[PDB]
């Protein structure tokens, strides 16, 4: 019948949502298998066959037929078919007139034949480049696109989307936006281990496997290890996270593995989730299965890939720890399961010491099973609330499956989106950028080149509080500028920020007069001592908006040559926007004559062959790869430069200029504008849905739980477009990626640095900026400053005005607008319109209750990217730097930090606030100055305890040696991932801290053992006292706490010029000199 | 101030039970015939429930890792005077409490009403390859009290497939 | 098996006495929660006798050796517990979201008795300091 997608219901075959896709070889012909959770059905796969292809480029378009005959005859052993095609190439002169590069499409039966054609062509390209129809072959193009990605782009098939599978291909539905519910399993495993070691799958057994399936809980137990039969129980850590656990008490480890594989086959999960199971759980199960003679691939379809990650065909492996590392925005100290559960699910999971797990299998197996089901519940609800909606939403737009969409770096996700858009516009993809092995600047070898990135300033240090007074010295001339700008800044807030007309605003002159009065009073009374308003002003999506405003892509940065070759280059040309950037070289002080002397010296040396099963053991310098030659040159240049010039590097900053074409084909920037608008769309839809979730009735179960999941969904597509945009912003410096643009990146950063310095220079004249980081300014304004207002429309709707924000946005629009933006109005006649583009807006966050900024121990130097901020309710809004939130560290400092942060909300003045904070500092100093003789001994232990985890012990450990390394070796002498719990001992005196690290487990050991090891570790054969207090280095712990007190409090107040509130912790000698020279 | 003392031996009969607002209303009702009763089917296996005159809750003990001491006020049999140590902010003693119990758990109450999924779905799909809906709903009620959408209950093993107006269930 | 909760006495006492005013109920009850393990001696009768008379830190009351383990000073919502000679705990009086209830299982007569209902608790969440 006639194919029309409008009559889809008459269209034949089967409709389904594509959940999983993989490349296959069919009876071999290359194809992609597509797995449809499908609607209605439990599932079904279908296959699309498609010829793998790539292009040849020619240097002379008049002789393409001579190249065609050559390649037909040269590739006859592997080529399926050949076709001449045309594509837009944005590097071709005058492509903006519809000139297209002529290309030879080579098509193959499968990806292996495509790879042989590449092996045959690469020698010709290497001969042509170093040294006839062979010399007409310029390059090969698009030869490195993954085959499933090719089929997904060329057929527009996307996971997360719904399709009807038909003879002609896949047709995207449009009526079904909600996902299907796949069967989701999530599991965790408990293993035996030796004391103070990591588990080894060669000798250690699986004790238990905990899992959840769709909200039901299960536990399998190995009764060789677990001492009692565990009964069915409930672990519900909140009413929104049910966990009913059915228990399978299996006789041995092989029955446990067989039950686990059987239950996977019965429920047919299309998602399996784990926490770090790519690197622990699946490796362990697979090695134990192999010891018992089970093949886990023939049992459940799971195998390790080329990266060593565990994958199947039908089922996607959703390791939650991949999303935690990439997307969760959690700092690396909060990326372990407990800290993720606390920060995302908002409860404390059960916590067991890894050294107690193997004992508790015999002594307390019920409490071990409660711990194991807690980590399955934590993993399942982490997956379902965060990872599931985020990854499947990304798949609806990215031409990748869930496993790749979870695991690839964000700059590769940008590459795939740009490849979709370039393909849809018939653009030819560039080959991947290869960094030059060496570069020179003024005859010096470059070690590295880059640009000046984001601008960052620490201007003030101190405690700032909404209830404590601050001095302000307003510049009267800044208020005169603001009074002169006020009419157009208010008009701009109606017309541009709120997208309305001034004629609809009933109270425009009322708001103008109210702001004018406050400004005049601040002009006349320009020196004030009043309460602050603590504000953050930050540029919405700064780098993306600079990129869209200036039409910045790597498709435009043109040289003077390409601009001179362009037929749009006339007298009067407006389309050549010139922008500045700051290049930064790091080079060796050595010159080209000295480089050549080092090269000639290395030519007389002999080198080991990186060859293995090969033979020739020794190479000359010129027989090395050029990359290896340069590695050896750089090594001898570092020694020579240090010997002759007394420095290894020089760094230089050069301001450069580049030409941004406005007439160049719009595909990059259209992707950014369009993506920005779709995200805004979903923020809007989100708000409409928020209204829908509250407008209606309260019978929660009345077929409106579908409405709330879709709210999560649009939020998720919002967050998804968000990550994609901020990524485009990064991708563009993705070394090795395509569409790379080191320049463009420098313009984006220097333009941003200029915007934020312009904003700071106004805020410094009307208030006090405290910290500046890239796109954000933290400041205090006078409490009398013009703040928030509402314009009233004739229809009774209110528009929002923040005057501190709109005064900056107006000045951004008068200084950084692109009046040269060109857009293609008529594609048949190549007619361009010129308009004024600018999308760069500050947003405002606050007002805040308190902000705390630390100072350096160095004179005149602030500490950047470190602060604590509090909301009006006294909750901790935002933090910077700091510890505690970290894995391990010294427990004393974590407990001190837990106490201190809430106390910055106390006191009515900045001195009063620092005095309340100083009370707590003195209490924590008393515990140390009293040698902690107080409290209980075990408690002293824990607090004093410092914990550190070793990555992989083994040979990395035969390797370096230090405190943990010393603790791990001392645990080995006494009893990957090992938790080195230790204290620092006073003896031996004058010994390095790394040799004074004693494992805490010695204090709980038998008196003879404790005595022998403490004597050996302190180097005191006469040690008879074994009290922990006489072993501890109280001076070391007092310096550690004193250094926390200096960084978090003494500095703030003393840096702001307030007397030192904790006198028992002195200031550094530079800061004492800086205060004395400030008071003189 | 109140002096806090501890006995050498605690009574383990004292246990902590969470009292919800509804439980409080029930507790403050002298009208009831039977106020509350602990019930169990047997001594060693079955669950224990708490019952009012018209409602039933199942009990769940929840252990915690803290030391929880309950103190009751007591009148010392003989006048006892304690020495003053370097303790600051101490008012005259007026009564005396003793920690008499050390509890490690609470008793939570959840309202409750006073077989293999895959196999049952297999047998359901057997007798009839394609099933209706209102026909299949009372047949699947028994598998998961999770309160779910009936379609999800079916999708635990069998699968739905639609057409013009009817939706049948196959595999 | 089955057994009733006897709550008549507590109920009658509750209706006939005023509403709970402070943290301590009119019947004289208090709970206490500590993030840790209270390390106490394993024996008491022998050790209660060597305590000097002036301290009275280990007293004897009605044939039972009670240890005087601390002092409590309540200042509004703030509360401080002094333990021994070397411990000071800072905490707060918090109103219970779920009013706790203490009961009593008389195994002898198979009777259960409601002892009391709480509404407040004294919590200490910070590491103990010396008494100064």
């Amino acid at each position: 019948g006639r194919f029309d997608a409008k009559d889809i219901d008459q269209i034949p075959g089967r409709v389904g949502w594509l959940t999983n896709m993989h490349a296959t070889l069919v009876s071999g012909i290359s194809g992609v298998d597509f797995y449809f959770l499908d609607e209605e059905g439990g599932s079904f796969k279908s296959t699309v066959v498609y010829d793998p292809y790539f292009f040849i480029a020619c240097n002379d378009e008049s002789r393409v037929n001579d190249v065609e005959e050559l390649v037909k005859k040269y590739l006859e052993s592997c080529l399926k078919s050949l076709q001449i095609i045309r594509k837009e190439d944005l590097t071709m002169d005058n492509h903006l007139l519809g000139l297209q590069k002529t290309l030879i499409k080579l098509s193959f039966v499968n990806s292996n034949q495509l790879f042989e054609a590449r092996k045959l062509l690469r020698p010709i390209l290497q001969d042509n480049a170093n040294n006839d129809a062979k010399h007409l072959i310029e390059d090969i193009r698009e030869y490195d696109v993954p085959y499933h990605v090719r089929v997904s782009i060329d057929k527009d098939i996307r996971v997360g989307k719904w399709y009807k599978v038909t003879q002609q291909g896949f047709i995207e539905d449009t009526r079904k936006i909600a996902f299907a519910d796949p069967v989701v399993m999530a599991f965790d495993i408990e293993t035996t281990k030796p004391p103070l070691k990591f588990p080894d799958s060669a000798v250690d057994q699986i004790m238990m496997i905990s899992y959840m399936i769709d909200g039901e809980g299960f536990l399998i137990t190995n009764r060789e290890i677990i001492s009692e039969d565990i009964e069915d129980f409930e672990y519900t850590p909140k009413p929104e996270y049910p966990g009913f656990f059915t228990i399978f008490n299996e006789n041995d480890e092989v029955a446990l593995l067989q039950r686990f594989f059987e239950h996977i086959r019965d429920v047919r999960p299309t998602v399996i989730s784990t926490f770090n199971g790519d690197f622990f759980d699946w490796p362990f199960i697979h090695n134990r299965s192999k010891i018992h003679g089970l093949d886990m691939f023939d049992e459940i379809g799971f195998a390790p890939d080329a990266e060593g990650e565990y994958k199947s065909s039908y089922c996607s492996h959703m390791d939650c720890f991949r999303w935690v590392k990439r997307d969760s925005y959690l700092p690396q100290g909060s990326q372990g399961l407990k800290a993720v559960t606390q920060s995302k699910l908002g409860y404390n999971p059960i916590e067991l010491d890894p050294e107690l797990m193997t004992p508790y299998a015999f002594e307390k197996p019920q409490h071990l099973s409660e711990y194991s089901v807690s980590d399955a519940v934590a993993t399942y609800y982490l997956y379902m609330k965060y990872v599931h909606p985020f990854i499947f939403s990304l798949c609806t737009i990215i031409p990748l499956n869930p496993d790749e969409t979870l695991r690839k770096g964000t700059g590769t996700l940008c590459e795939m989106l740009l490849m979709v858009q370039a393909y849809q516009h018939n653009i030819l993809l560039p080959n991947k950028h290869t960094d030059p092995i060496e570069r020179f600047y003024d005859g010096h070898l470059l070690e590295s080149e880059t640009y000046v990135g984001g601008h960052v300033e620490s201007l003030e240090a101190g405690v700032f509080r909404s209830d404590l007074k601050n001095e302000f010295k307003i510049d009267p001339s800044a208020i005169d500028e603001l009074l002169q700008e006020l009419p157009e800044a208010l008009k701009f807030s109606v017309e541009v920020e709120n997208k309305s007309s001034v004629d609809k605003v009933t109270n425009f002159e009322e708001i103008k007069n109210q702001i004018t009065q406050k400004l005049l009073e601040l002009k006349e009374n320009n020196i004030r001592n009043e309460l602050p308003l603590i504000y953050h002003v930050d540029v919405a999506s700064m780098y993306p908006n600079i990129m869209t405003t200036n039409r910045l892509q790597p498709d435009s940065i043109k040289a003077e040559r390409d601009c001179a070759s362009c037929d749009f280059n006339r007298p009067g040309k407006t389309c050549a926007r010139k922008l500045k950037w700051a290049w930064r070289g790091e080079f060796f002080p050595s010159k080209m004559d000295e480089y050549n002397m080092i090269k000639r010296a290395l030519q007389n040396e002999t080198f080991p062959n990186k060859n293995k099963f090969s033979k020739k053991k020794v190479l000359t310098f010129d027989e090395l790869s050029y990359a290896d030659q340069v590695i050896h040159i750089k090594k001898r240049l570092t020694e020579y430069s240090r010997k002759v010039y007394h420095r290894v590097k020089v760094s230089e900053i050069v301001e450069r200029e580049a030409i941004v074409c406005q007439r160049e084909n719009p595909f990059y920037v259209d992707t950014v504008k369009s993506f920005r608008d779709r995200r805004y769309e979903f923020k809007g839809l989100a708000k409409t849905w928020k209204g829908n979730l509250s407008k209606i009735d309260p019978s929660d179960k009345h077929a409106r739980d579908e409405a709330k999941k879709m709210i999560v969904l649009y939020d998720s597509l919002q967050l998804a477009h968000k990550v994609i945009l901020n990524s485009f912003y990064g991708y563009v410096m993705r070394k090795g990626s395509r569409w790379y643009s080191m320049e463009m990146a420098g313009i984006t950063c220097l333009t941003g640095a200029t915007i934020i310095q312009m904003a700071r220079a106004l805020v410094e004249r009307v208030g006090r900026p405290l910290e500046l980081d890239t796109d954000g300014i933290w400041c205090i304004l006078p409490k009398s400053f013009p703040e928030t207002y509402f314009f009233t429309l004739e229809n009774g709707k209110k528009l929002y005005l923040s005057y501190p924000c709109s005064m900056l946005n107006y000045r951004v629009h008068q200084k950084f607008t692109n009046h040269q933006y060109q857009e293609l109005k008529d594609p048949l006649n190549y007619i361009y319109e010129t308009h004024s583009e600018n999308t760069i807006f500050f947003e405002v966050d606050g007002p805040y209750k308190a902000m705390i900024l630390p100072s350096s121990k160095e004179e005149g130097k602030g500490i950047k990217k470190r602060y604590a901020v509090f909301n009006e309710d006294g909750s901790l809004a935002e933090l910077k730097g700091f510890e505690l939130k970290r894995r391990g560290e010294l427990q004393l400092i974590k407990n001190f930090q837990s106490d201190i942060f809430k106390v910055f909300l106390e006191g009515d003045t900045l001195e009063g606030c620092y005095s309340a904070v100083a009370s707590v500092c003195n209490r924590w100093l008393d515990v140390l100055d009293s040698h902690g003789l107080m409290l209980e001994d075990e408690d002293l232990v824990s607090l004093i305890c410092e914990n550190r985890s070793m990555s992989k012990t083994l040979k990395e450990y035969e390797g370096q040696k230090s405190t943990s390394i010393t603790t791990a070796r001392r645990l080995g002498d006494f009893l990957k991932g090992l938790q080195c719990k230790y204290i620092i001992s006073s003896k031996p005196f004058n010994a390095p801290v790394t040799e004074r690290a004693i494992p805490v487990a010695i204090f709980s050991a038998d008196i003879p053992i404790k005595r022998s090891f403490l004597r050996r570790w302190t180097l005191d054969p006469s040690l008879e006292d074994l009290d922990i207090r006489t072993i501890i280095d109280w001076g070391y712990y007092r310096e550690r706490l004193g250094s926390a007190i200096q960084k978090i409090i003494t500095i703030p107040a003393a840096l702001q010029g307030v007397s030192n509130p904790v006198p028992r912790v002195e200031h550094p000698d530079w800061l004492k000199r800086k205060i004395a020279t400030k008071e003189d | 101030s109140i002096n806090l003392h501890s006995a050498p031996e605690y009574d383990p009969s004292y246990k902590l039970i969470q009292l919800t607002p509804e439980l409080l209303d029930i507790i403050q009702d002298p009208v009831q015939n039977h106020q509350l009763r602990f019930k169990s089917l047997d001594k060693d296996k079955s669950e224990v429930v708490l019952c009012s005159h018209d409602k039933t809750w199942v009990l769940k003990q929840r252990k915690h890792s803290n030391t929880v001491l309950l103190m009751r006020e007591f009148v010392p049999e003989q006048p006892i005077t304690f020495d003053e140590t370097l303790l600051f902010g101490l008012s005259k003693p007026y009564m005396d409490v003793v920690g008499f119990a050390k509890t490690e758990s609470e008793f939570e109450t959840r309202e409750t009403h006073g077989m293999d999924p895959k196999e049952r779905f297999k047998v359901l799909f057997r007798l009839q390859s394609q099933w209706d809906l209102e026909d299949i709903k009372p047949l699947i009620e028994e598998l998961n009290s999770r309160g779910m959408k009936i379609d999800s209950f079916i999708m635990k093993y069998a699968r739905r497939k639609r057409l013009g107006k009817k939706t049948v269930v196959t595999s | 098996p089955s057994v009733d909760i006897d709550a008549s006495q507590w109920q009658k006492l509750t209706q006939s006495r005023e509403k709970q005013t402070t943290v301590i109920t009119p019947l004289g009850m208090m709970m206490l929660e500590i993030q840790g393990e209270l390390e106490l001696p394993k024996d008491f009768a022998s050790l209660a006798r060597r305590d000097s008379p002036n301290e009275g830190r280990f007293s004897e009351q009605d044939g039972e050796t009670l240890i005087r383990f601390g002092s409590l000073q309540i200042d509004g919502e703030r509360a401080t517990l002094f333990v021994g000679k070397k411990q000071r705990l800072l905490g707060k009086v918090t109103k219970l979201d779920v009013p706790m209830g203490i009961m009593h299982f008389n195994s002898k007569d198979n009777k259960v008795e409601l002892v009391d209902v709480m509404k407040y608790k004294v919590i200490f969440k910070d590491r103990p300091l010396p008494i100064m």
Partner: peptide, 26 residues
């Protein structure tokens, strides 16, 4: 005589809910 103290737990932990048997009470 001065050997009474609290061994401080670094963080508050609440354990898993457990079923109750008749023997759990007595």
């Amino acid at each position: 005589t001065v050997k009474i103290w609290v061994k401080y737990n670094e963080g508050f932990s609440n354990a898993v809910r457990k079923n109750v048997t008749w023997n759990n009470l007595w």
